[PDB]
């Protein structure tokens with residue numbers, strides 16, 4: 415059911431099995447990179463313990479990372495059964511295309527993982543560099559949904575820890591800052607009532 | 615403007631369209647503080663690395679990856695077998711080139727094996743303005759960059775170098791990496807492993823198999839850092 419769907423929830427406690435299988439998984443997780451963050455974070459084991467393996471049989475994983483999440487995210491990415499096969503970097507600019515620890519950071523990283531044998535994808539249509547203007551902080555550019563749609567068009571995609579601006583067609587956004595539940599694929603609406611007769 | 619869309623349409627990588635106080639003093643301070651350049655031909659596989667002394671403040675590591683020759687290649691197997699920790703100083707740094715393949719993972723294993731924590735991930739992003747190819751089997755996207763990993767052990771610049779892509783079969787890494795290293799002021803014992811004749815540089819020691827001449831002598835090399843020079847950052851006025 416092509417249009418946007420989403421589920422406000424805690425991603426730690428949500429039975430993801432009801433949701434089926436996806437050609438692409440994307441997550442921009444609120445990593446505990448210390449620094450007493452202004453948002454709620456997941457601890458390393460909570461990230462480790464997420465139920466990613468039940469989401470895909472053959473497809474790609476997209477995982478934003480920063481700071482120590484570069485090594486951790488690689489851990490989670492292998493622990494979940496993926497192989498890091500690419501790594502996109504987003505170069506942050508301003509409205510006139512100039513760039514915004516030890517070095518000042520001009521980019522943010524996004525590990526690309528694969529699982530199983532995926533077939534039908536148009537690998538190699540985009541390159542691994544995104545150049546886009548920073549909107550709000552903590553956000554991530556819209557261009558990645560273009561790259562992902564070209565990669566695997568018309569297929570089911572799931573986002574984890576999505577915020578409301580993340581809701582896109584062909585996609586299902588999960589996250590704790592969303593407006594309730596909005597489900598249109600009947601197979602999902604059925605497995606959801608079966609598992610959650612009275613909401614969660 | 616969607617520049618990923620543009621690349622899909624026109625062949626121009628999104629990095630093609632990135633546009634572009636005076637810290638010139640801390641440049642003449644490096645230039646005066648630099649030791650005379652020192653170099654040494656060596657087959658680093660066959661070569662006992664401990665014979666390189668004293669312990670280095672900075673190690674720059676540029677091993678020849680198979681992927682550099684799309685058109686001897688060290689595997690990450692060979693690289694990880696290197697005994698880096700034996701010549702690195704208690705407090706020291708490392709800059710490791712990792713390409714864009716398995717090296718982005720395997721090189722982090724190296725970093726931890728030699729006892730460093732990654733603090734900085736430096737990206738050489740290659741513009742193709744002069745010519746709008748092959749993909750790795752497992753590659754999802756066109757690879758248009760290389761990564762240089764930064765590691766520390768013990769207790770001004772940006773993390774991006776943008777240059778045009780080098781001609782096929784040219785393998786130099788941009789000299790901007792040296793500027794970024796030197797502006798950190800990390801010490802004066804600087805080792806460039808797998809450098810070439812063209813990478814020799816004042817302030818550095820270059821060890822590599824393709825070097826055509828040598829002038830290394832551990833005693834002479836140590837004489838540049840005996841007191842009262844043992845601790846200089848590389849960014850200070852010389853002592854008389």
Ligand SMILES: Cc1ccc2nc(CNC(=O)c3cc(=O)n4ccccc4n3)cn2c1
Nearest residue numbers: 423424425442443444454455552575589590
């Ligand atoms: C880079 C960045 C920074 C902030 C940020 N916030 C979100 C949205 N967060 C969530 O959806 C979510 C869902 C959930 O179940 N949680 C359960 C326990 C604790 C937190 C928690 N957060 C993405 N972000 C990316």
